[PDB]
Amino acid sequence: QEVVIHKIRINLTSTKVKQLENVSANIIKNAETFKLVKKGPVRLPTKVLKISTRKTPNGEGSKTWDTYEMRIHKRYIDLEAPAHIVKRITQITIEPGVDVEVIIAA
Amino acid sequence: GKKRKKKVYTTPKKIRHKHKKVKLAVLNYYKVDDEGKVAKLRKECPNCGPGIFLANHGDRFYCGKCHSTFATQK
Amino acid sequence: MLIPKEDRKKIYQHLFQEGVLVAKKDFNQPKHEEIDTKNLFVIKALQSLTSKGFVKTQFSWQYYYYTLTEEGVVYLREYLNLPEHIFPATYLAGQS
Amino acid sequence: AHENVWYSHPRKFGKGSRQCRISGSHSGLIRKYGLNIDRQSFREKANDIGFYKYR
RNA sequence: ACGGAAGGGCACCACCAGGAGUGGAGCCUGCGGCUUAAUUUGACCAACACGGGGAAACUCACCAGGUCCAGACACAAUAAGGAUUGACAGAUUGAGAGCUCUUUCUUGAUUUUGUGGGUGGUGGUGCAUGGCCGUUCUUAGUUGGUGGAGUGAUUUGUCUGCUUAAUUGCGAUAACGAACGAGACCUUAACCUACUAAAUAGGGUUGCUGGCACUUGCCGGUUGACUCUUCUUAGAGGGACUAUCGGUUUCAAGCCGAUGGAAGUUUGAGGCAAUAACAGGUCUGUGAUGCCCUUAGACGUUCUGGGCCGCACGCGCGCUACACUGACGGAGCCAGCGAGUACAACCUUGGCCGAGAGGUCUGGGUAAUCUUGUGAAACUCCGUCGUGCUGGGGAUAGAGCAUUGUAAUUAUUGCUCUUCAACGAGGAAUUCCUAGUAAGCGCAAGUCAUCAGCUUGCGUUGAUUACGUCCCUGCCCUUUGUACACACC
Ligand SMILES: [Mg+2]
Ligand SMILES: [Mg+2]
Ligand SMILES: [Mg+2]
Ligand SMILES: [Mg+2]
Ligand SMILES: [Mg+2]
Ligand SMILES: [Mg+2]
Ligand SMILES: [Mg+2]
Ligand SMILES: [Mg+2]
Ligand SMILES: [Mg+2]
Ligand SMILES: [Mg+2]
Ligand SMILES: [Mg+2]
Ligand SMILES: [Mg+2]
Ligand SMILES: [Mg+2]
Ligand SMILES: [Mg+2]
Ligand SMILES: [Mg+2]
Ligand SMILES: [Mg+2]
Ligand SMILES: [Mg+2]
Ligand SMILES: [Mg+2]
Ligand SMILES: [Mg+2]
Ligand SMILES: [Mg+2]
Ligand SMILES: [Mg+2]
Ligand SMILES: [Mg+2]
Ligand SMILES: [Mg+2]
Ligand SMILES: [Mg+2]
Ligand SMILES: [Mg+2]
Ligand SMILES: [Mg+2]
Ligand SMILES: [Mg+2]
Ligand SMILES: [Mg+2]
Ligand SMILES: [Mg+2]
Ligand SMILES: [Mg+2]
Ligand SMILES: [Mg+2]
Ligand SMILES: [Mg+2]
Ligand SMILES: [Zn+2]
Numbered sequence: 103q104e105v106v107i108h109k110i111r112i113n114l115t116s117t118k119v120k121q122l123e124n125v126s127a128n129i130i131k132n133a134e135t136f137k138l139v140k141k142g143p144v145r146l147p148t149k150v151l152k153i154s155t156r157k158t159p160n161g162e163g164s165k166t167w168d169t170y171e172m173r174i175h176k177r178y179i180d181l182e183a184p185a186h187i188v189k190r191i192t193q194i195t196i197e198p199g200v201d202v203e204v205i206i207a208a
Numbered sequence: 209g210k211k212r213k214k215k216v217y218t219t220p221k222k223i224r225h226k227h228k229k230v231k232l233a234v235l236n237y238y239k240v241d242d243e244g245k246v247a248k249l250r251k252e253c254p255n256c257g258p259g260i261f262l263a264n265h266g267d268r269f270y271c272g273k274c275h276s277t278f279a280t281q282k
Numbered sequence: 283m284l285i286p287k288e289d290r291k292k293i294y295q296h297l298f299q300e301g302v303l304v305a306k307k308d309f310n311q312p313k314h315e316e317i318d319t320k321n322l323f324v325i326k327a328l329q330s331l332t333s334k335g336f337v338k339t340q341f342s343w344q345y346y347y348y349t350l351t352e353e354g355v356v357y358l359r360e361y362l363n364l365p366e367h368i369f370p371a372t373y374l375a376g377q378s
Numbered sequence: 379a380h381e382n383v384w385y386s387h388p389r390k391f392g393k394g395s396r397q398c399r400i401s402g403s404h405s406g407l408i409r410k411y412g413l414n415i416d417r418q419s420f421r422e423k424a425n426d427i428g429f430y431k432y433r
Numbered sequence: 434a435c436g437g438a439a440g441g442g443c444a445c446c447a448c449c450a451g452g453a454g455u456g457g458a459g460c461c462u463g464c465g466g467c468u469u470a471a472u473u474u475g476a477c478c479a480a481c482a483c484g485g486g487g488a489a490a491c492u493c494a495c496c497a498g499g500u501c502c503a504g505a506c507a508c509a510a511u512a513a514g515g516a517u518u519g520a521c522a523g524a525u526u527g528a529g530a531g532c533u534c535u536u537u538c539u540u541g542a543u544u545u546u547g548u549g550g551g552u553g554g555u556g557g558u559g560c561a562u563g564g565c566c567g568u569u570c571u572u573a574g575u576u577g578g579u580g581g582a583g584u585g586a587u588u589u590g591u592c593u594g595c596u597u598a599a600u601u602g603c604g605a606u607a608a609c610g611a612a613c614g615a616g617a618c619c620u621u622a623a624c625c626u627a628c629u630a631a632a633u634a635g636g637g638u639u640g641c642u643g644g645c646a647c648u649u650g651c652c653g654g655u656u657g658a659c660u661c662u663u664c665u666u667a668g669a670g671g672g673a674c675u676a677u678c679g680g681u682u683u684c685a686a687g688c689c690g691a692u693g694g695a696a697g698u699u700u701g702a703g704g705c706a707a708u709a710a711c712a713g714g715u716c717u718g719u720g721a722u723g724c725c726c727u728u729a730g731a732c733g734u735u736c737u738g739g740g741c742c743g744c745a746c747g748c749g750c751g752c753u754a755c756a757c758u759g760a761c762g763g764a765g766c767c768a769g770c771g772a773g774u775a776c777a778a779c780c781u782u783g784g785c786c787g788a789g790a791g792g793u794c795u796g797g798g799u800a801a802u803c804u805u806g807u808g809a810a811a812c813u814c815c816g817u818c819g820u821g822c823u824g825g826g827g828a829u830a831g832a833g834c835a836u837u838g839u840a841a842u843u844a845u846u847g848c849u850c851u852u853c854a855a856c857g858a859g860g861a862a863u864u865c866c867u868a869g870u871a872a873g874c875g876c877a878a879g880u881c882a883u884c885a886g887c888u889u890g891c892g893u894u895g896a897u898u899a900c901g902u903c904c905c906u907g908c909c910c911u912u913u914g915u916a917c918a919c920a921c922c
Contacts, residue, residue, distance in 0.1 A: 117428050123668065142630035145667035147801060152771085153410055153429070154879075154889050156566095159418040160715035161484030162476060163567030167889065168421070169704090170429035171620090175667075176801095178633080209557055210474075210494085210732095217730055218498085225533065227545090232514050253538095263538035265522070272538035275520045283503085284518060284544060307402070307720095309503075310385045310735095326503070327543095333505045333551090341720055343399060379501035380530040384735050387490065388839070391882045394491035401719035404492055405555090406485055410772090410879070417485075418565075418718060431704050432620040 104185035111180045112192060113203040117172055121200050126177055132191045138183040146176035180207070237261055253278055283330070285323040291362075292319065293327055297350060298358055301370035303328060307344035331357075 112129065116122035126143045133140055150173045157166040181188055192204050238246050251269045253260045255278060262269035262280070271278035285293075296317055297303055305314060305324050314321045328348050331337040336354030340347040350358070350370065359366060389395045393404050400419040407416050415423070424430075 119668080126668095141632090143668090144631035144633090146633080147666055150770095151411075151429075152878090152890075153408065155408075155417045155421055156483085156485065156888095157421070158484085158566045158715085159421075159564085159718070160475090160566080161486085162714055163479060163483090165483075165888090166567075168431075169433070169890085170421070170424050171432050172428050172430070173432075173620095176633090177667080180632095212556080212732070215730085215732095219730075222533075222730065225531075227515090227517060228537090229515060229517090234514090261538070263521085263536080265536050265538095268522080270521055270536095270538065272520060273540090275539070277521090279521050283505095284540095287541085287543060290543070322503070326505075329505060329552095335506090344397070344402060344720085379735075380532075383528075383530050383532090383737090384500065386736070389491060391838085392491055393488075394493095395882095398719080403555095403718050405718080406880090408879090409881085416718065422565085430620095433702085433704055 106184070107182055108185060109180065109207050110183055110188050111178060111205045111207045113176065113178050113205065114200060115174055115176060115203075116200040117174055118199065119175065121197050122175055122177060125195075125197065125200050125202070126179065128195050129179060129191065132195075133181060133183070133188075136183075136187050136191070138181055138187070140182070141180045143177055143179050146178065149174045149176070251280075251282070283323050283326045285327055289319050289323070290327065293317065293324055294358055294361055297328075298362065298364070298370050301350045301372040303346075303348040305346045305348065307346065 114122060114125060116125075130140070130143060150171060152169055152171045154167055154169050157168040189204075192202065196202055237249060239249070241247060248261070250264055251262045252258070253262050253271050253273070256271070256273040260271075260273055262278070263272055264270070268279060268281040303324075305321060305328065309322050309325075311321050313319070314324045317324060325346060328337060328346070329339065331354065332339045332348075334357075336351055336357050338349045338351065340349070350372070355370060358370075396404070396407055396409065396414060398404075398407060398416045398419065399414045400416065400423075403416050405416070406418070407414065408420055413420060420427075
């Protein structure tokens with residue numbers, strides 16, 4: 103008997119965008135399918151990772167500098183939902199790559 | 209590039225620590241009581257177990273299983 | 283390698299226990315992981331097996347990936363004289 | 379190589395305390411985020427890692 | 434290819450008008466030279482704050498030395514009356530190293546010593562190679578299918594003109610139809626009262642309170658409720674395509690102006706970026722690698738110490754100043770990119786201390802939460818100084834107190850006090866630059882135990898002068914000439 107509300111939260115991380123958007127939309131749609139209340143898929147600022155390297159491997163010539171970057175997004179979502187429904191929702195339909203985290207926030 | 213020259217040493221030669229093999233080394237540990245019992249010589253290290261013998265250097269015996277811990281004068 | 287004989291049985295029985303070893307490049311270190319011996323003579327005993335022709339070596343990011351062959355399984359077996367019906371862990375065949 | 383002498387110097391910190399995890403080269407290492415890769419094997423394998431040219 | 438030959442165009446690594454500088458001074462950093470035992474090396478527009486090269490250990494390559502095998506495999510040799518390992522104390526050693534030895538004790542077939550062989554080598558060889566990137570060359574160039582012209586080297590196709598930043602097109606055409614390059618594309622910065630939403634972001638109403646007024650008021654505080662998404666985020670998206678109009682154009686590619694808009698320079702900046710090449714460079718990045726050398730008193734590996742930091746000397750990036758628009762005291766108080774502790778010990782709030790550096794007690798933060806709203810300088814206001822190497826300038830010297838480090842001496846670094854150098858805006862020359870740009874000013878990140886004078890990114894105060902030409906230095910296309918082709922060196 104875990105019918106009581108738990109104020110659960112789902113964190114997401116993804117080096118890409120398309121699969122992250124698909125996962126978030128799927129979670130929202132499943133929540134509506136089971137008719138649960140929510141705070142929307144609030145977006146988080148683009149955590150951009152930039153590191154610069156001397157493009158030459160030795161060190162001579164015209165000083166050339168290159169920049170390598172990723173861009174990750176979090177998009178946390180909080181659900182005022184019971185226990186087993188949200189567990190079943192978050193343990194299904196996870197396309198590869200997009201890291202998902204679940205916290206009871208009790 | 210790098211150019212080198214023949215290395216000249218300031219010490220003639222260092223010889224390896226050749227191990228000292230001894231002919232019938234165990235004759236001096238145990239002796240026979242005239243076709244009978246067996247006896248030890250000069251001491252027996254107790255901690256290591258039966259049959260282990262200390263090393264005499266002068267006025268003191270020395271281990272060699274637990275070499276540094278046990279060095280007892282006599 | 284003056285690898286002590288009891289640690290020699292230990293390395294062989296452990297390589298029997300799983301059949302695949304890792305043994306990171308790092309020399310100098312006190313204790314091989316899940317083996318309790320200095321890593322260096324682990325590396326050298328295993329490469330001795332490779333040179334005898336019973337272990338294949340594969341290098342990747344300083345990690346000495348080692349795999350054991352059938353004749354290696356043999357040599358290991360008569361070294362431990364464990365009955366021939368039993369095999370190292372790798373040959374435990376699990377279906378998908 | 380009396381164990382108390384050989385390799386006794388500590389390498390907790392400094393240049394030689396870290397290896398490339400690729401070639402072990404101490405020179406020019408990327409310690410940011412614990413990549414622990416040098417500049418150039420990193421530029422080799424970065425497109426595979428996830429870094430990309432954007433700007 | 435070249436021409437101090439012609440024509441057509443371009444480029445602030447060219448100039449013009451200018452702006453800021455360097456070269457003058459001090460100091461840092463890097464080479465050269467010298468010295469040294471080593472002051473390790475590779476570089477010579479495209480070497481010199483580059484090898485992320487801010488080396489006190491490691492770093493490492495050098496020097497004095499001291500250690501060990503990390504010689505796998507097979508054969509042979511010896512071999513359990515011992516192949517052989519290790520070891521207290523002492524001499525020896527810098528070492529509490531059984532390095533070596535004195536004695537003996539310990540260990541046992543793994544080793545030891547010859548053989549072939551093998552491993553490692555920031556050893557030589559980037560004029561043996563890969564890969565990588567630099568440069569030719571940021572320009573607009575480059576081939577191939579047939580077809581024509583030449584016997585052919587080859588050419589046309591790729592071009593008379595005009596246009597563009599562009600081999601970009603309009604076009605003309607023994608040339609036709611296609612490919613790479615450019616563009617297209619990707620990221621970013623611009624505009625969204627349009628949608629989706631949001632306690633890790635902001636508001637508004639209202640609670641509950643604090644003040645100051647008295648009147649409804651204002652400034653506040655509050656992880657109490659309601660409510661919303663312009664402000665901050667991120668998704669689908671929209672928006673610009675020179676849109677419209679007016680000039681000019683064998684009236685066509687297009688160019689100029691005005692207006693509307695946010696944006697009219699390809700909207701801004703970049704990211705990728707062709708054929709051919711270089712004896713450009715990196716074996717010093719690799720367990721990328723050919724060959725050569727070495728492979729046990731070792732060019733392997735590792736430990737201690739010194740060095741790469743020294744000094745009559747030249748040169749380059751640099752930092753701070755020569756003062757008044759300044760210096761110094763007070764008073765205000767504005768940012769953005771970042772980054773941040775885990776199998777280890779980071780960001781550090783807040784509180785007690787110390788003048789300081791710094792110390793301590795506690796708290797959050799694995800991160801739109803906390804550091805942090807990084808309350809940053811420059812700047813703004815008010816004061817002292819008032820032309821004098823002066824309170825400018827802070828190098829050079831001592832004395833102390835701190836923190837990092839196993840190790841601060843050849844001063845690591847910060848603070849306290851004192852000493853106060855040269856320097857009067859710097860020769861011939863030379864460097865960079867057209868709008869948020871130069872410059873000034875900082876900030877963050879990388880290098881990190883500790884350090885920057887560096888570099889990479891960010892924001893802030895934010896301009897003068899063009900808006901053009903081949904005069905200098907080059908580049909592109911065509912024509913022409915040559916006794917040049919390892920090509921005017
Ligand atoms: Mg110009
Ligand atoms: Mg010039
Ligand atoms: Mg001029
Ligand atoms: Mg200046
Ligand atoms: Mg000067
Ligand atoms: Mg050039
Ligand atoms: Mg240093
Ligand atoms: Mg040193
Ligand atoms: Mg050393
Ligand atoms: Mg030496
Ligand atoms: Mg090496
Ligand atoms: Mg070589
Ligand atoms: Mg033809
Ligand atoms: Mg042609
Ligand atoms: Mg393009
Ligand atoms: Mg809005
Ligand atoms: Mg018109
Ligand atoms: Mg552009
Ligand atoms: Mg090109
Ligand atoms: Mg060359
Ligand atoms: Mg070459
Ligand atoms: Mg060496
Ligand atoms: Mg140096
Ligand atoms: Mg001079
Ligand atoms: Mg420079
Ligand atoms: Mg002053
Ligand atoms: Mg801010
Ligand atoms: Mg003075
Ligand atoms: Mg200034
Ligand atoms: Mg540097
Ligand atoms: Mg000729
Ligand atoms: Mg001549
Ligand atoms: Zn004993």
